[PDB]
Design an enzyme around this catalytic site. Structure first.
Site, PDB file in Angstrom:
ATOM      1  N   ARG A 264      16.536 -82.299  10.860  1.00  9.58           N
ATOM      2  CA  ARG A 264      17.728 -81.451  10.805  1.00  9.58           C
ATOM      3  C   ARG A 264      18.653 -81.782  11.972  1.00  9.58           C
ATOM      4  O   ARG A 264      18.197 -81.945  13.102  1.00  9.58           O
ATOM      5  CB  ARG A 264      17.369 -79.959  10.810  1.00  9.58           C
ATOM      6  N   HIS A 268      17.930 -74.860  15.497  1.00  5.76           N
ATOM      7  CA  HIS A 268      16.896 -74.163  14.738  1.00  5.76           C
ATOM      8  C   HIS A 268      17.492 -73.018  13.923  1.00  5.76           C
ATOM      9  O   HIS A 268      17.293 -72.939  12.708  1.00  5.76           O
ATOM     10  CB  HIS A 268      15.786 -73.657  15.664  1.00  5.76           C
ATOM     11  N   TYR A 278      14.936 -79.351  24.347  1.00  5.32           N
ATOM     12  CA  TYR A 278      13.646 -79.894  23.904  1.00  5.32           C
ATOM     13  C   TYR A 278      13.690 -81.282  23.249  1.00  5.32           C
ATOM     14  O   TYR A 278      12.645 -81.903  23.059  1.00  5.32           O
ATOM     15  CB  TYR A 278      12.915 -78.892  22.997  1.00  5.32           C
TER      16      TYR A 278
HETATM   17  C1  LIG Z   1       4.536 -65.527  11.125  1.00  4.32           C
HETATM   18  C2  LIG Z   1       5.791 -65.905  11.907  1.00  4.32           C
HETATM   19  N1  LIG Z   1       5.677 -66.280  13.183  1.00  4.32           N
HETATM   20  C3  LIG Z   1       6.732 -66.613  13.902  1.00  4.32           C
HETATM   21  C4  LIG Z   1       8.002 -66.582  13.341  1.00  4.32           C
HETATM   22  C5  LIG Z   1       9.170 -66.981  14.259  1.00  4.32           C
HETATM   23  C6  LIG Z   1       9.744 -68.320  13.820  1.00  4.32           C
HETATM   24  C7  LIG Z   1      10.779 -68.404  12.965  1.00  4.32           C
HETATM   25  S1  LIG Z   1      11.129 -70.041  12.721  1.00  4.32           S
HETATM   26  C8  LIG Z   1       9.939 -70.673  13.728  1.00  4.32           C
HETATM   27  C9  LIG Z   1       9.718 -72.175  13.924  1.00  4.32           C
HETATM   28  C10 LIG Z   1       9.013 -72.711  12.663  1.00  4.32           C
HETATM   29  O1  LIG Z   1       9.319 -74.097  12.432  1.00  4.32           O
HETATM   30  P1  LIG Z   1       8.784 -74.848  11.123  1.00  4.32           P
HETATM   31  O2  LIG Z   1       8.718 -76.287  11.448  1.00  4.32           O
HETATM   32  O3  LIG Z   1       7.588 -74.162  10.584  1.00  4.32           O
HETATM   33  O4  LIG Z   1       9.993 -74.601  10.074  1.00  4.32           O
HETATM   34  P2  LIG Z   1      11.491 -75.075  10.408  1.00  4.32           P
HETATM   35  O5  LIG Z   1      12.253 -73.801  11.026  1.00  4.32           O
HETATM   36  O6  LIG Z   1      12.211 -75.389   9.000  1.00  4.32           O
HETATM   37  O7  LIG Z   1      11.576 -76.231  11.332  1.00  4.32           O
HETATM   38  C11 LIG Z   1       9.263 -69.574  14.257  1.00  4.32           C
HETATM   39  C12 LIG Z   1       8.095 -69.725  15.237  1.00  4.32           C
HETATM   40  C13 LIG Z   1       8.102 -66.184  12.005  1.00  4.32           C
HETATM   41  N2  LIG Z   1       9.279 -66.123  11.389  1.00  4.32           N
HETATM   42  N3  LIG Z   1       6.998 -65.858  11.320  1.00  4.32           N
END
Ligand SMILES: Cc1ncc(Cc2csc(CCOP(=O)(O)OP(=O)(O)O)c2C)c(N)n1
Ligand SMILES: Cc1ncc(Cc2csc(CCOP(=O)(O)OP(=O)(O)O)c2C)c(N)n1
Ligand SMILES: [K+]
Ligand SMILES: [K+]
Ligand SMILES: [Mg+2]
Ligand SMILES: [Mg+2]
Ligand SMILES: [Mg+2]
Lengths: 365, 42, 324, 324, 365
Positions: A264, A268, A278
């Site tokens: 992306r 975020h 980062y």
């Molecule tokens: C159960 C729970 N714990 C923490 C969080 C808080 C969070 C929202 S988005 C994020 C990063 C996740 O990155 P990922 O690589 O999985 O997906 P992406 O954004 O497309 O790069 C976190 C920690 C939420 N929403 N739910």
């Protein structure tokens, strides 16, 4: 002292998940064997939707900074991963998206103004039209995975030739629900397509801090279901992988895990997050040449199936539609406490019946 | 019937008065530790 | 017919499986084996593995499976083996199913009934007897039901299953087979959120639920030997509370106590007390006192007898209110 | 110095990291990035990656990590990004760490402090602003702290980290940078389970916690113009409650209300009301009423201002008690 | 349509997890180059512990039946898996057992009477002696796994040359915590040994119903850590696998997942009516030859290191010690509410101070 072949084990296994690619960085076909059957008209449509989604992202980010939109999780760069995967689905398929997978549900039937309402925080944004098979974006990472297994089981039980598809990121693969989701679907041989979009980051956290697993697609081994690693910047590859998984699932052969290697370009989310805390600049510029729009544009052009005239038309059509959507959302009446109470149960319990009267009184002024 | 906060009711009982025969000077006829006192009184 | 509480539950499940083909029953060891306490015995044999089935050992997955199935038109009746294991599936229950209808403005709903046993007095291992009904009672979107008799269980369960929103149905371990009661054959329903009076009384109101209803009945029976008439009200649903029935009983007697097996800092007793104070304060002859367990973790098996509240504690507390 | 609440939080953590080598800060994006609200900003840079580090994205795994590290002599201070994700780690919190000292009869203990933000007013997405303090407050073995000012936040956090048992520290999003307050430099503690008087009053007792303290103080200032002297109590620990302080104030005023941001069926207001109605029922001249949110799922962002309880609701309810 | 090589994928991953065996059913060495270096006395004590544990199970089942014990999870059949694994550990190693893994913590330093108090339900039963590195048996399947990743990390940070070992069954591999635990330990490269005891049943539910994965050891692939499937009915194979995982761990190379293939001869638990829940009458009869004691007995007798007189002495030592432990347990003073209150916190909060006084008044009169 006796030694186990741990290294050989780790190499041999990871070897079973090579990156699947159809179009390279220059728009050249590197795998004609796996080339999906797509008419000139479908190829165009796919490009239009990917260009459309790019503008949507650009427009959503702008609107959020103007305070016109609320929660927004940028999508630019994940067009192939999101759009081409959806391009392989049918109306009957059920989508269980995450917070960043709003584009998938738009193309599947969710009106654009309702997508904006979701962003702002209005219940009507989640009032998906009847017959449109999606859930609003899931905020709890991993929850969509175990729900998808149930949806897939439901489809299987009613004997419908359709699949349940869900999406999560690299970070989500560390959640328990992610593993329970894929395992349950495997145990029940349920028609579910599990997509893992690996953009290298879970917010500020690089994918290496999540797991030591060489690939994320290999996590399917734990559930005993097939796993595929694909070039997430390649529309044809993503489409081909999902189409196969769909074909396999409707034929009653079970679920499949798909890891898309994408990236992306934006932050975020649109609240506080600063990428320069980062990641490097000599890392952002690289994935710019890998842009899904670039290679697909060249691929279509060499075929004389695309031009900057058609592309500009889609761009302007997108802006005009975003224009009307944001307006239609603004015109949506504001939510009243009585509204939120009424949607709690089919028939309100005593405590809510009382409170309903209280706020019905207050709203009269 | 009758109405009084519990502190009151328990004042009246401690004191062997039957609050039920006392005239409250409160909202809706609520009797107050003030009516029991003007009873203990004449 | 004379049925135990587990028999009335099994009968109620059979009624729903027969009546509505959308009804599904699933969880750890509920299919072929018929459950840990035989609550689902014979059901798979009659309706098939397609209707009654075992799942992998994961409460969170079981919860997501139920949500997913509900989205596909089914009426899920999953089972959490012991309510102590609810900690594994709190998101599916509270962060998801309890919020679906609201989250989708009515577009989707969750006609789910979660069955799960709890309660002590049978010397179970750790995290089997804990009372955690007070947790789910705090989540808007859920109804929590706790029957104390075979008749209540059958009727309430049928209501719970037909109810188109999530209902948590808590089954007390000690009450499964402790006694028999005349239960009508065929289907009948009891409204959720409606309490009943297990014993008419005029001097004091004793509010209770679960296995504490029997303890309250024993205490009342003993209080009567001294001329103390206690009215025992069985909540039968702890969320939502039957305010009309509770206040009605309190206003008539002028004295009240709430009895729960859960720890004082837990359960739903504080909510009852707060509602009584709010609506019937000027009818109270004394403070509404609570009978509850010490604020420690649920006790090691051997210590149940001294830790768990019983009829003698209800007597002592009741007399404290009478003599206030 | 003049500090915001977030700055006080950071200072408190910095002091513990320096004074106690066993203190570890971990969780999602708390390291190099310094947390989503910058509460852990600069800590990794000053104390190292071994003490302040990021974890894979798994709340349950984070809870299990703190438990295991505590068994090896460490003083874990993990973070749950938003307290709405507490459903993913309920077992580690309520079924595990809160029970270890009891479970092991004192042999092992859990000197763990879990930090987590909550509260509305800033238009966050789903499950970010929910008030779920009522769930953990029902679990024996846990302490739940919720500061309303920078001075309190720092002192209570230092005490929380020092306490050898699990303490859940809830940080209200809206209060992070709402205002500045004079905060002493260096280490200083504030007893856990101790409330304080924010405004000394004589006519009615306003009891609150979190963001509702500012709404209470703001409400009291307006009640003064109407000749009503309101005493504002900040619980500052919701479990355990400061009975001594709560009851002393009610014994002076004779009238009280409890204000919370959580839904009426949630939070800890009912427990507060039940304790007052029992210990000082002889000093009550009016029923103790509650100011709380409607019993629906936390509102979609745009509906926050009409759903969240504020100073005007406290005005209306306080006057309702005075005119009873 | 293009076809992905999934059947090939499934077959290739299977080849990476062959069953590790050292002794066949007849006590013959089938893998000489993997043979662990154990002295004659060590070999004798391992057998002594397995026979002891076998007797421990018989007596535990009997006492439970006499109401002299409470909750009990039969262990007969898993001696090699339970005992030979523990035999590879050192005093400094930390064990996080499940509800069925009582024999491990007993040999690791937990007095037998205290283990009996755990069955009955008495706090003193969990008061592990100081210096003994174990946790009371975990009833929440999977919890011991995420806690293990935590303990191992603690050891790593302290610079200790020790490991955290934990055990779960086939059913427990379906839990989110099982996955999170092994994934965390991998990500933190922590010295943890995850043991999975597969007897094909999770109470009434066969393993094929837990997952479609053909082995449970392959689940290590999702965490990116090495996995080993071993003949759980073979003491030498089990010991060698745990030893190898310990060395790897203490050298800072991370955790290992060990799947032990075994069979239990008794009921699931003694909680009614489990002891007669079934049980399969003929399925057990062919596993009577696979008994760990049988092959290991023959292995020692052919080396002139064991005899039936020596075995009888062990049985007598077990019975005598079992009676004095159950007797010592009976003599332990009953639990009072004040006791349970005193162990809740270091410093009791206000509510407990009050209740402590209430229950002290009740305990004195
Ligand atoms: C159960 C729970 N714990 C923490 C969080 C808080 C969070 C929202 S988005 C994020 C990063 C996740 O990155 P990922 O690589 O999985 O997906 P992406 O954004 O497309 O790069 C976190 C920690 C939420 N929403 N739910
Ligand atoms: C979180 C949770 N959910 C359910 C249960 C209830 C249970 C106790 S034992 C058991 C079967 C476990 O089979 P497995 O093969 O894993 O282990 P084994 O006994 O050695 O054969 C269950 C489901 C518990 N304890 N915890
Ligand atoms: K229902
Ligand atoms: K602490
Ligand atoms: Mg990512
Ligand atoms: Mg989980
Ligand atoms: Mg098993």
């Amino acid at each position: 002292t006796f030694q186990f072949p741990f290294a050989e084990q780790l190499e041999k296994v990871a070897e079973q998940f090579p990156t699947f690619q159809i179009l390279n960085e220059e728009g050249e076909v590197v795998n004609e064997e796996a080339m999906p059957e797509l008419s000139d008209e479908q190829l165009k449509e796919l490009m239009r939707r990917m260009v459309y989604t790019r503008i949507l992202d650009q427009r959503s980010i702008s609107l959020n900074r103007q305070g016109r939109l609320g929660f927004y999780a940028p999508t630019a760069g994940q067009e192939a991963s999101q759009i081409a995967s959806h391009f392989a689905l049918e109306k009957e398929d059920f989508i269980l998206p995450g917070y960043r997978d709003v584009p998938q549900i738009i193309w599947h039937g969710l009106p654009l103004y309702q997508a904006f309402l979701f962003s702002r925080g209005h219940f009507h944004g989640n009032q998906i039209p009847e017959g449109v098979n999606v859930l609003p974006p899931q905020i709890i990472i991993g929850a969509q995975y175990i729900q998808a297994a149930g949806v897939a089981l439901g489809l299987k039980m009613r004997g419908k030739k359709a699949v349940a598809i869900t999406y999560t990121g690299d970070g989500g693969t560390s959640q328990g629900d992610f593993y329970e989701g894929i395992n349950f679907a495997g145990a029940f041989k349920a028609p579910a397509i599990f997509v893992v979009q690996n953009n290298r980051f879970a917010a500020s956290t690089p994918v290496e801090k999540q797991t030591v697993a060489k690939t994320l697609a290999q996590k399917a081994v734990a559930a005993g279901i097939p796993g595929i690693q694909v070039d997430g910047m390649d529309p044809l590859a993503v489409y081909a992988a999902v189409k196969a998984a769909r074909e396999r699932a409707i034929n009653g052969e079970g679920p499949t895990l798909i890891e898309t290697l994408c990236f992306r370009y934006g932050p975020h989310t649109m609240s506080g997050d600063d990428p320069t805390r980062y990641r490097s600049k000599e890392l952002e510029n690289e994935w710019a040449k890998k842009d899904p729009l670039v290679r697909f544009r060249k691929f279509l052009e060499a075929k004389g199936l695309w031009s900057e005239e058609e592309e500009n038309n889609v761009i302007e059509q997108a802006k005009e539609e975003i224009k009307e959507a944001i307006k239609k959302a603004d015109e949506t009446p504001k939510q009243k406490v009585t509204d939120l109470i009424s949607i709690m149960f089919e028939e309100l319990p005593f405590n809510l019946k009382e409170q309903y009267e209280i706020y019905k009184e207050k709203e009269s002024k | 019937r009758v109405i009084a906060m519990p502190s009151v009711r328990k004042y009246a009982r401690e004191k062997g008065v039957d609050i039920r025969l006392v005239q409250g000077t409160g909202k809706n006829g609520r009797v107050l530790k003030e009516d029991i006192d003007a009873f203990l009184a004449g | 017919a004379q049925m135990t509480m587990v028999q009335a539950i099994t009968d109620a499940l059979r009624i729903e499986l027969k009546n509505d083909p959308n009804v599904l029953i699933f969880g750890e060891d509920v299919g072929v084996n018929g459950g840990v306490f035989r609550a689902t015995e014979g059901l798979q044999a009659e309706f098939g593995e397609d209707r009654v089935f075992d799942t992998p050992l994961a409460e969170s997955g079981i919860g997501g499976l139920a949500i997913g199935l509900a989205l596909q038109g089914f009426r899920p009746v999953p089972e959490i083996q012991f309510f102590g294991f609810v900690y594994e599936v709190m998101d599916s229950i509270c962060g998801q199913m309890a919020r679906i209808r609201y989250r989708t403005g009515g577009r989707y709903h969750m006609p789910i009934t979660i069955r799960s046993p709890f309660g002590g007095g049978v010397h179970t291992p750790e995290l089997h007897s804990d009372s955690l009904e007070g947790l789910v009672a705090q989540q808007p979107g859920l109804k929590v039901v706790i029957p104390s008799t075979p008749y209540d269980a059958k009727g309430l369960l049928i209501s719970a299953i037909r109810d188109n929103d999530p209902v948590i149905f808590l089954e007390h371990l000690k009450l499964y087979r402790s006694f028999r009661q005349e239960v009508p054959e065929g289907e009948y329903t009891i409204p959720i959120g409606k309490a009943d009076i297990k014993r008419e009384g005029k001097d004091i109101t004793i509010i209770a639920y679960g296995a504490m209803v029997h303890e309250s009945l024993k205490a009342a029976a003993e209080l009567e030997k001294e001329g103390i008439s206690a009215e025992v009200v069985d909540l039968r649903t702890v969320q939502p509370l039957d305010i009309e029935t509770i206040i009605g009983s309190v206003e008539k007697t002028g004295r009240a106590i709430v009895v729960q097996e859960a720890q004082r800092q837990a359960g739903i007793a504080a909510n009852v007390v707060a509602e009584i104070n709010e609506r019937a304060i000027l009818s109270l002859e004394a403070p509404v006192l609570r009978v509850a367990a010490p604020d420690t973790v649920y006790p090691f098996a051997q210590a149940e007898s001294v830790w768990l509240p019983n009829f003698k504690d209800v007597i002592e507390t009741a007399k404290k209110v009478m003599n206030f």
